[PDB]
Amino acid sequence: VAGGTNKSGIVRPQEIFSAKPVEAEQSSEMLLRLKNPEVETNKTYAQEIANSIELITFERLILQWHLLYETYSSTKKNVMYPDFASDVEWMTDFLENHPLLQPPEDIANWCIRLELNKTTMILKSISLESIINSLRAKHPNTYIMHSVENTASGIPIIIRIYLRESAFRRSTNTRMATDEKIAVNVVDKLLNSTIRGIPGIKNANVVKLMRHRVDAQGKLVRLDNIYAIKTNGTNIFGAMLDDNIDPYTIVSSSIGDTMELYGIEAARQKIISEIRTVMGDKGPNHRHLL
């Protein structure tokens, strides 16, 4: 009955018969087959691909964030919040350790201070440079500073993102938005940025599945040593863009997603497969699912 895997009561049957959209599905899944029949034999490769695709947003690496009305100039002393005036110690280190990353000339008067959760950075095995590169690639209208990767508890890792003036120049003809409203909207975009995953899928386990195959001598053999990925959450297009997944044999449990990408004939086959799953094994004949 847990959120994301709710199969209690009559909930999956209601999702099928009411033709509910993908957004209203509480137990959506997906089975992904590795592009390499050789890779699919070994579980470590299947396990590292499964953990490779797991939506870690920037928000879930955060303990707390502060939106500050500050500007950064390396030479001129600008005013800073009294609680975070101690951050200046690692400002200087960042500037001498990144001579190519000098602060620009168009920094706006808006700053976002971040305090990374170190337990999640360890449990999820996410490095600091993975976060910084992901944020810099997706958000070019910002300037990002951070402390060093510390291995001692009690000393936090601080991500400080300065907004450039180009962020407000994007659309300011829509005057019904104060600079505080754009700056807050920038916070929401940056937090929801994708780090090391595909959107829409929460958990990606590894399952063992058996399939048939024709040998070179013509025999049909059931192969039990095949490893796949059963995700929690559905994104066919996101998995279709991955190079570690075979895109032609993506099996979604979502009728709405299969109809969106494949068509009405594949969606017809999806309704049959999804009613049969609910029916159990003391289920009706196939012609009643048809």
Binding site: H66, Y69, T71, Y81
Partner: protein, 105 residues
């Protein structure tokens, strides 16, 4: 917030040429110096932070409904401790009525 020195009202914050100006409804206007450069904030995992369980952890050795463990207290050398398990990471804290607290708190 900023409190008007005249009528003790909650002033409205605006931004002019890179400075914060608090304007009240009585016409009085002030400009914040340093402590007002905090537009917004949020803190995550509020349901398992140390600031939430301070009173509970302080009161844990005296609650008779808390689990005990047969392990010596290194301070007063009492032969039992009170064990508590807080958070989704299942953090274990041993406490004693003398003030001892595993995790050094």
């Amino acid at each position: 917030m900023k409190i008007c020195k005249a009528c003790s009202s909650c002033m409205v914050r605006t931004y002019v040429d890179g400075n914060i100006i608090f304007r009240c409804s009585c016409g009085e206007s002030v400009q914040g110096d340093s402590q007002n450069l905090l537009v917004s904030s949020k803190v995550y995992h509020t349901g398992e932070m140390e600031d939430k369980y301070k009173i509970f952890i302080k009161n844990a050795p005296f609650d008779p409904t808390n689990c005990q463990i047969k392990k010596d207290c290194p301070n007063c050398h009492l032969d039992y401790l009170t064990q508590i398990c807080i958070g989704s990471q299942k953090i274990i804290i041993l406490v004693c009525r003398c003030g001892y607290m595993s995790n050094r708190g």
